Every structure is written in structure tokens, then in C-alpha cells.
Design a protein around this ligand. Structure first.
Ligand SMILES: [NH3+][C@@H](CCC(=O)N[C@@H](CSCC(=O)c1ccc(-c2ccccc2)cc1)C(=O)NCC(=O)O)C(=O)O
Ligand SMILES: [NH3+][C@@H](CCC(=O)N[C@@H](CSCC(=O)c1ccc(-c2ccccc2)cc1)C(=O)NCC(=O)O)C(=O)O
Lengths: 215, 215
């Protein structure tokens, strides 16, 4: 009844896996080879031709953020968004902030030496705004347990760690971002996340290859 | 109780005016001078320092798309989104598509001659995807009346007309985009929109100035 066209390394696909597992929704995972996209992927997502794509009752939903809100509305038990409209607006605001700022991380795989240090400091400032104004003193973006905002920021955990190792730069460190670094550790320790993350060695190999391609 | 920090020309501010007027919500409009931003604007929107900003009960909500969803959740009567989760996901999908593709219009105020023709054809293709896959044969993106998707695309009416005149290029024409061109005319004729749009001559003057700045 539920199919997920995805991948073993995409952080965007993992957002959907986490949301489905938090809802207890059974699904079939269909791994796509992006160098030879299936006929179903091209039919289901003609606008972007990207994964993930959720297919529910044969109807497709593309774009991880759109999929996450569809899951929250379709399986409302175990809520992943607050009930209060102002708190829901703040959650959407921070999700949107992450979506817009994800592009700033691209420079980490394009710049060298004294230019790469500049890109890293700019990414630290993006994360500092998120830490100070978004997370604050809460354990998670969702308070005492993870919500759609934590899920949307999950790419800043093992994927960002792999990016830092591939590029030879440090961004999310405890001295510079104490609360965000503690959050990243707490997020990765949540059993649902711990049991559903790519193997670090395989993820690092993938990131080194993406960096090689972008020079 | 409701304040809107805005402007007389911003299409993003007009999205919020339309949503508030469709809900029958009384509000005070506070026009911001972006060359000398008020202390309230900087306090209410420290992340982006942009308008619009809605202030409801003294609590601020920045980003037009976030504001629109807050208005829909706070004043649920006269709904501006469908009830079905799949239809709601499609609405969010197209709103997101417009938000990402709005950047492609920037090239219309940066390119010249045989390069500007290329930027215009790329923008026509963005609109053709929206027309074929989003609007289809419906009168409005919301069916028989306007919804948040029509509101999000309202910038493709008089603002885009002004951009076409300022740059000397044609993008949204009836021969090339028959259904989208009919939609744009129908949208502008909705009494709520007709009574709440900037004066075209003033909007054109503003667009000519933005183009002069971007060369
Ligand atoms: N907006 C879409 C994006 C999906 C997408 O790009 N899908 C790719 C495959 S996944 C991309 C990925 O491997 C990747 C990995 C890590 C990051 C990352 C991590 C941390 C910090 C910053 C960046 C970002 C992206 C695709 O189908 N591609 C189609 C094709 O290329 O043919 C969504 O939200 O679903
Ligand atoms: N993501 C924000 C954007 C808001 C924004 O950019 N605000 C500007 C003022 S408005 C921008 C505008 O005048 C404008 C006009 C027309 C278009 C347009 C029209 C049609 C087709 C394509 C593009 C796009 C933008 C600001 O505060 N600026 C802060 C500052 O510059 O100091 C939102 O959705 O609220």
C-alpha cells in the first residue's frame, strides 16, 4: 500500500524512512539507480525526476518536505508537529530556513584553502542562528522528543560529519556550537534514528565521490 | 490585534493582504522603508530582516508562505486549502515549485539580447510545467475559487506584466500559454484581487528601477 522510491545514502530519503517508522507505517523500499532511473520514477516525478517519492495507494508524492507533511496529515497519531498554530508556524519557518540554507554547504566541496575556511565559517554562522533562535535550550527541536523539525535537520548529523571528513574542514564542533553539537549527539542516539542511518564508512565513501565530481 | 509590516509594491506583502481580506481579518498596515528599517522590523525578523511580517497578539510571523499557512490555521473558516491530505500535498508541492522557480525570473533583469531571449524561453518553460501539470483545465489552482496556490502565483499577474514591460521581453502570452494566460486574467478580475493590487504605473516605475540596479 505504501512504496518509497529511495536510496541507501540520500538524507532526503532517510527523512521519509524516519517519519514512516515513527508512524508505524509498513512500506516497501525501492532503491533507485540515479544513472538509470526507473520508468515508475519518471512517471511519478516528471517535474524533478528525483528521489524520494512516496507512493500511497498508487498516488505519488514527491519532495521530502511535502512527503513529511502528507505523512503527518494522513497518519495523525504520534504527532510530529505541535497543535498550536503559532508553534506550527515556527516549525515551518525553521524547516524552510534549513531548506534555503542547505545550498550554502555546497561551497564545502568547491572551495580550497583560504576560501574553504570562509565557506566553513559561513556554514557555522548558519548553524549558530539555528542553534540560538531555533533550538534554544530544548533537548530537541520538538521539545522532549523528535518532531518534523528534528527530522528536517537530521542531515546535519552523520551526513554533515562525512562532508567534514571528505573536505578536511570542521563545522559542527562542541566548543563553537555547544547546544547544537549536544543535539546532534542526542538525535543520533534516539533508537529510531540509531537503527535507521546509513553505515558511516559507506556514507563517507559516497561523500568523497561527490566531492571528487564537484572538485 | 493584527499588524502587517509591508510595502505598497511587494508581491509577497500582497499575498498576505489577500489572505487576510479573504478571511475578513481586520489589520493595520505598517509600510516599511527598506533603506531605513524600523526597530520593530529588525526585532521581529532578525533572521532575514525582510517584509512581510505579520504580528498577531504581539507575536511575529515572517516569510509570506509561513504567514499564509498560519492565517489558514488561525482563521479556518473560508478555507484556502483543500481538506483531503493528497490534494493538500499537491497544493504544497506547487507552492514549493513556484518558490524555487521564482529565482529563474532574475535573469530577465540581468541578460541582454541573445541571452535575454534564452532566459525568457526558460521562464516560459517553468510556466508551461505549472500550466500543464498544476492548473490543467481548472478555472483557478483552487478549482472554482482562489486558494493559497492561486495566491502564491499572483506575482505572475501584474508584477510579471511590469517585469515584461521593463525588460522588453514577452513571457506569459495567450498563444504560448493559453490556459495560464486565461487564469492570469481571471485572477486579476476576482473582485478581492482587483480592489487590492498596486497601481500598474507605480509598479512599472518600481520594476524599471530594480532592473536599472541589476543592470
Ligand atoms: N528537494 C528534494 C531533494 C532530493 C534530491 O536532491 N534527491 C537526489 C538524491 S539525494 C542527493 C544527495 O546525495 C545529497 C547528499 C547529501 C546532502 C547534504 C547533506 C548534509 C548537508 C548538506 C547537504 C545533499 C544531497 C536525486 O534524486 N538526484 C537526482 C539526480 O541527480 O539524478 C527533496 O527534498 O526531496
Ligand atoms: N521569502 C520572502 C521574500 C520577501 C522579500 O524578498 N521581501 C523584500 C521586499 S519585496 C521584493 C520585491 O520588490 C520583488 C518584486 C517582484 C518580484 C517578482 C515578481 C514576479 C516574478 C518574479 C519576481 C520579486 C521581488 C525585502 O524585504 N527586502 C529586504 C531588503 O532588500 O532590504 C517572503 O516570501 O516573505
Amino acid at each position: 500500500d505504501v512504496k518509497l522510491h529511495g536510496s541507501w545514502v540520500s538524507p532526503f530519503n532517510y527523512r521519509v524512512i524516519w517519519a514512516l517508522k515513527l508512524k508505524g507505517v509498513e512500506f516497501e523500499h525501492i532503491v533507485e539507480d540515479l544513472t538509470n532511473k526507473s520508468e515508475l520514477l519518471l512517471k511519478y516525478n516528471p517535474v524533478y525526476k528525483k528521489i524520494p517519492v512516496l507512493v500511497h495507494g498508487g498516488k505519488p508524492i514527491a519532495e521530502s518536505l511535502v512527503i513529511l507533511e502528507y505523512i503527518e496529515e494522513t497518519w495523525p497519531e504520534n504527532p510530529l508537529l505541535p497543535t498550536d498554530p503559532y508553534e506550527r508556524a515556527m516549525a515551518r519557518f525553521w524547516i524552510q530556513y534549513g531548506a534555503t540554507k542547505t545550498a550554502a554547504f555546497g561551497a564545502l566541496f568547491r572551495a580550497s584553502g583560504e576560501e574553504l575556511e570562509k565557506a566553513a565559517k559561513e556554514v557555522v554562522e548558519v548553524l549558530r542562528v539555528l542553534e540560538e533562535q531555533g533550538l534554544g535550550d530544548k533537548k530537541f527541536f520538538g521539545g522532549d522528543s523528535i518532531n518534523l523539525v528534528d527530522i528536517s535537520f537530521g542531515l546535519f548529523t552523520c551526513w554533515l560529519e562525512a562532508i567534514e571528513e571528505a573536505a578536511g574542514v570542521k563545522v559542527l564542533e562542541p566548543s563553537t556550537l555547544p547546544r547544537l553539537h549536544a543535539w546532534a549527539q542526542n538525535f543520533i542516539e534516539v533508537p529510531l534514528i540509531k537503527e535507521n542511518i546509513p553505515d558511516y564508512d559507506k556514507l563517507l565513501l559516497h561523500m568523497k565521490g561527490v566531492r571528487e565530481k564537484m572538485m
